[PDB]
DNA sequence: GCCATGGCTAGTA
DNA sequence: CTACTAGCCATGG
C-alpha cells in the first residue's frame with residue numbers, strides 16, 4: 001500500500017460517516033486495515049484543502065474529544081461544524097471539547 | 109542514519 | 122477524573 005493509497009482509502013472511509021454521527025482516528029485506521037495508523041489517519045485529515053467536501057469534522061479522538069492543534073485552535077471549526085450537525089458538546093477543565101462517544105458514534 | 113514533530117492510543121498510576 | 126508513559130509511524134531537516 002503506497003501512501004497515496006492509504007490517503008484515499010481513509011478519505012473514502014471518512015466520507016462514509018453520516019450527518020450527526022462521528023468516528024475516530026483509530027477506528028478508521030482499523031476500518032481500512034491499518035490498525036497501527038491512527039496518527040497517519042490524522043495526517044490525512046490535516047492534509048486537506050479547506051474547500052474539501054469531506055466530513056473531516058466527523059473524526060475526533062478515541063478519548064471522545066476534539067484533538068488539540070499545533071496548527072492553532074482554528075479547529076474550533078470542528079466544534080461548530082459538529083454543533084450544526086446536531087452534536088451536544090461540552091467543555092471540560094481545560095475546555096477539552098467533549099462529546100458522548102457511545103451516543104454519537106459510527107458503527108457499520 | 110539521527111532527530112523532532114504530530115488532529116494517536118492503550119495501559120498505568 | 123487527570124497525567125504520564127510506551128508504542129506507533131509518516132515526514133521533513
Ligand SMILES: *CCCC(=O)c1cccnc1
Nearest residue numbers: 045046048049050056077
Ligand atoms: C482537516 C481539516 C482542516 C481544514 O481544512 C479547515 C480548517 C478550518 C476551516 N476550514 C477548513
